[PDB]
Structure 1
Amino acid sequence: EGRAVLTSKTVKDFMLQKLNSLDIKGNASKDPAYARQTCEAILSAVYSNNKDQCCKLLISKGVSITPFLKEIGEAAQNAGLPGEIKNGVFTPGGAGANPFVVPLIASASIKYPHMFINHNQQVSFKAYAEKIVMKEVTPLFNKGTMPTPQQFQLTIENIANKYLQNAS
């Protein structure tokens, strides 16, 4: 939106405008690498968010997310983003912190010092930021055989949620 208050989703709003004006697909249209590197890394973001979200509470139980990472690596293998594997475990190739949210959040970290001041706010900012791109990134998952962010996130979350509970 546009206003001298931008409250109720401020960055989220500017992040939303960026999200739309970032034209994740538009870049995928001009950049056949962008379309492919940010098509697997988006779901690799959920993959990592899964290892971030699941491991977050898991580091509290003293569990082992590696076996869970093995599961998101499945989705990360079946989704089309492979490239790493170890003791009976696999890791997705382009697995980072969301190539769409990185600069999206980088701009908002540069733009919104106030909202990004807290060490956990810019980290949480990218969490709902990888959720909006799913409205812009989903179309890159239309060409080929890629899973949707929500279909893949749930299947991933399903392993985060599986390791999430575990007696607790």
Structure 2
Amino acid sequence: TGDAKQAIRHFVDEAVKQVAHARTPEIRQDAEFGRQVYEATLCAIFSEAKDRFCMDPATRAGNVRPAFIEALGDAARATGLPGADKQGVFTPSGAGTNPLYTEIRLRADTLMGAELAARPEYRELQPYARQQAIDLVANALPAERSNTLVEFRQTVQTLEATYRRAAQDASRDEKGATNAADGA
């Protein structure tokens, strides 16, 4: 409770397992629907990537979002994620789906939702479950798609920390008195 970093984190692990097994026999049953989870795995991580950076109150205005969005598009480009290039931006679709991570999210959500989950520690605790949940999807293809998945995975995580670290600097110069960042 005093270190949601480890506590709330371990609660997630359990949930993940339960589902892990739940949707494990189906993936091995047939080699196809498992590959569908690969595309959704990225997309879920992508719409969330943008949403995470966007929602973060410490990153509302000109917090480097423009570049953050393009980076993801560039990174998702090499991956080979289905999509299309519109004007000058690459985008797959509107929110993947998240039918797996959402299931474990519900279990832990109803369990934690406590003061420990309050602390901003839940931030870093982003690749904890994914690393696992996504590991399963890797089972259907832990060879290639895996290399691609593990890449876009760490790529996004570092993309946020790097973009956040920068914005954080701007936040320091933001506070003042008037016209701090109204951009009227």
Could you tell me the TM-score, scaled by structure 2's length? 0.61
Aligned length: 155
Is contact 2:16–2:132 with CA below 8 Å preserved after alignment?
A: yes
- Aligned residue type for 1:47: F
Mark the structure with the bigger radius of gyration.
Answer: 2
Structure 1: distance between partners of 2:47 and 2:67: 14
Change (3 A) 1:93 1:142: farther
Residue 165 (str. 1) matches residue 165 (str. 2) = yes
Is contact 2:42–2:149 with CA below 8 Å preserved after alignment?
A: yes
Is contact 2:47–2:94 with CA below 8 Å preserved after alignment?
A: no
Is the partner of 1:137 in helix, strand or coil? helix
Is contact 2:40–2:96 with CA below 8 Å preserved after alignment?
A: yes
| Residues 18-167 of structure 1: pairs in structure 2 closer than 5 A | 18-24=18-24, 26-30=25-29, 32-55=31-54, 56=56, 59-60=59-60, 62-93=62-93, 95-96=95-96, 98-106=98-106, 108=107, 113-116=110-113, 127=126, 128-142=128-142, 145-166=145-166, 167=169
Structure 1: distance between partners of 2:146 and 2:111: 37
1:35 CA displacement: 1.5
Is contact 2:31–2:140 with CA below 8 Å preserved after alignment?
A: no
Change (3 A) 1:161 1:9: closer
Identity of aligned residues (%): 26
Alpha-carbon deviations, 1:45-70, whole Å to 9, x = none? Answer: 32233223333266245324243222
Aligned to 1:15: 15
1:88 CA displacement: 1.0
Alpha-carbon deviations, 1:95-146, whole Å to 9, x = none? Answer: 436332012223x16xx6342478x77xx59943323213322234435545
Change (3 A) 1:130 1:145: closer
Structure 1: distance between partners of 2:143 and 2:71: 24
- Aligned residue type for 1:14: E
Change (3 A) 1:58 1:84: farther
Over aligned residue pairs, what C-alpha RMSD do you find?
Answer: 3.6
Structure 2: distance between partners of 1:74 and 1:90: 7
Higher relative contact order (CA 8 A, sep 6+): 2
Structure 1: where are the runs of 5+ without partners? Answer: 1-6
Between 46-55 and 125-134, the greater mean CA deviation after superposition? 125-134
1:9 CA displacement: 5.8
